[PDB]
């Protein structure tokens, strides 16, 4: 699959050899071309994966994620060139280099056949993200956010490494195919319980799980717009992909080791949906929305059924697109008024009608309106949970109401009412921002047209 990896490593020197005023054009054009190339991975089989070599393979679960990453890179490039206009040429090239390196690490992570290689790449993704957050963030909290982003990850991932090597000294292989075929049940002992915890906690903290999520609001609020985009749409799905991969060796311990995490996921989904109802920061509201959706995904992965896995895959794809769109929509208003408070700029539908339409579509998709893929994933997960236990329909149902409320709340706070009188610097929407919104929203409904592409291997 080097036909995708090599063009990114070629994006690197092309950016570093570009003329000072042509970096954005070249980067965007060739990133779009790389996305078009990566579109060919959607042609999957029904029985096994695409085993390209001893190192890399593609599956029906990782191909949509790869397509989403390669599609997200150009969107980040367009969203970044506004607030980086005054930067020097060298620092702009460094920023683009960080973005390209992040894409390369994510591409190699989603296709690694080996669990230690997966760990190495899934840990290497931290350095570009941390550098971006702590160098190009705007306020003084960013430094603290970086620390919160770093150690929260590492404290979860360092035990996993130990567990991984332990497994390789017992079974002799960490290759995913051999691991799947030579799978054996896990007994009920304290050592197996702690091995389960070591294998699970890293991906549960990257989701993030409720109670372990405190890093996410900081990281997604103090980051630049591209950083928030990549953190919310792709980097949160590393936990889901890793859990879906690693759960093949944890049965039947999961059958009873999932209870605390299931309880945390459901109650914290309710809790974060409620938190969204009282939020003075517009970016924090989107961050907590991400927390709630990822709690739903955690439940789906933890109950371990084919319908749950299908719904979880669809929900990850839909959430990535939707949250990236919401972050960009909030960043437009921030760039206009230089403040993140939701009740500062009001009645924006009067001043920006097409932006109000984009806001309406994003909010309608966030609350899982049929037949959007958000709804497909949510409904599949809810049906699987109902099969798991009939009482869950209470909590899930509760969430379905609360989400809608806060979603429309945001819209009604930002677009309706009367405009603030003293704010007179609201210029007409640029073609770049409208194109960004359209390129976010059109793929969502296009995938709604053909939903089996994002339903995962269990389809």
């Amino acid at each position: 699959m080097l036909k995708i990896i090599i063009p990114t490593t070629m994006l690197l020197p092309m950016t570093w050899m570009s003329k000072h005023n042509m970096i954005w054009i070249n980067a965007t054009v060739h990133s779009l071309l790389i996305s078009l190339i990566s579109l060919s991975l959607l042609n999957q089989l029904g029985e096994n994966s695409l085993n390209f070599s001893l190192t890399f393979f593609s599956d029906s679960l990782s191909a949509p994620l790869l397509v989403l990453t390669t599609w997200l890179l150009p969107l980040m490039l367009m969203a970044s060139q506004s607030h980086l206009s005054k930067e020097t040429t060298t620092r702009k090239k460094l920023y683009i280099t960080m973005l390209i390196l992040l894409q390369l690490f994510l591409i190699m992570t989603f296709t690694a056949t080996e669990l230690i290689l997966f760990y190495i790449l899934f840990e290497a993704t931290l350095v570009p993200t941390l550098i971006i957050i702590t160098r190009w963030g705007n306020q003084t909290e960013r430094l603290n956010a970086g620390l919160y982003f770093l150690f929260y990850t590492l404290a979860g991932s360092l035990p996993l490494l130990v567990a991984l090597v332990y497994i390789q000294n017992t079974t002799g292989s960490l290759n995913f195919l051999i691991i799947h075929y030579w799978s054996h049940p896990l007994s009920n002992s304290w050592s197996n319980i702690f091995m389960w915890l070591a294998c699970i906690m890293a991906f549960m903290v990257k989701m993030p799980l409720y109670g372990l999520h405190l890093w996410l609001p900081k990281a997604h609020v103090e980051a630049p717009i591209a950083g928030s985009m990549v953190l919310a749409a792709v980097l949160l799905k590393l936990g889901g992909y890793g859990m879906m991969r690693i759960t093949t060796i944890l049965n039947p311990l999961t059958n009873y080791m999932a209870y605390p995490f299931l309880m945390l996921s459901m109650w914290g989904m309710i809790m974060t949906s409620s938190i969204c109802l009282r939020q003075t920061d517009l970016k924090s509201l989107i961050a907590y929305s991400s927390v709630s959706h990822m709690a739903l995904v955690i439940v789906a992965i933890m109950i371990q059924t084919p319908w749950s896995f299908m719904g979880a895959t669809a929900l990850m794809i839909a959430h990535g697109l939707t949250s990236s769109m919401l972050f960009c929509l909030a960043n437009t208003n921030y760039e206009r008024v230089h403040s993140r408070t939701m009740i500062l700029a009001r009645g924006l539908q009067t001043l920006l009608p097409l932006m109000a339409t984009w806001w309406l579509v994003a909010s309608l998709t966030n609350l899982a309106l049929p037949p959007s893929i958000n709804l497909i994933g949510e409904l599949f997960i809810i049906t699987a949970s109902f099969s798991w236990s009939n009482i869950t329909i209470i909590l899930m149902g509760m969430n379905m109401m609360i989400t809608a409320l806060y979603s429309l709340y945001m819209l009604i706070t930002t677009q309706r009412g009367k405009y603030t009188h003293h704010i007179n610097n609201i210029k007409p929407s640029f073609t770049r921002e409208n194109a960004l919104m359209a390129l976010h929203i059109l793929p969502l409904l296009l995938l709604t047209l053909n939903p089996k592409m994002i339903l995962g291997p269990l389809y």
Partner: protein, 104 residues
């Protein structure tokens, strides 16, 4: 000095519409701006979006859905014609399965 340090003042933000009434929001230079818009629109909507959707819509059936339907039709026809049950509770022949000798 009653001050703490020597620093530049915070400058006011620049409006791209002042020097370019039709500015597209891409760059301060009108030509580079216009061509950034053109390449974004051509390679995002014309090339990737429409052609990619056409390519995905016409992907060959490697999931073997139609083949599975035809196989099921064959098997249903045969088992209904000869009176055998449509499905068996055992997916493996018991003759190749060796149960343990003693259950007590």
């Amino acid at each position: 000095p009653t001050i703490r340090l020597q620093e530049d003042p915070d400058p006011e933000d620049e409006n791209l519409y002042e020097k370019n009434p039709d500015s597209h929001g891409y760059d301060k230079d009108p030509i580079v701006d216009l061509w950034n818009m053109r390449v974004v629109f051509f390679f995002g909507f014309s090339i990737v979006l429409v052609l990619g959707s056409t390519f995905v819509a016409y992907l060959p059936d490697y999931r073997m859905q139609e083949w599975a339907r035809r196989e099921a039709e064959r098997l249903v026809k045969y088992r209904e014609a000869n009176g055998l049950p449509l499905m068996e509770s055992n997916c493996f022949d018991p003759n190749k399965i060796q149960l343990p000798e003693d259950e007590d």
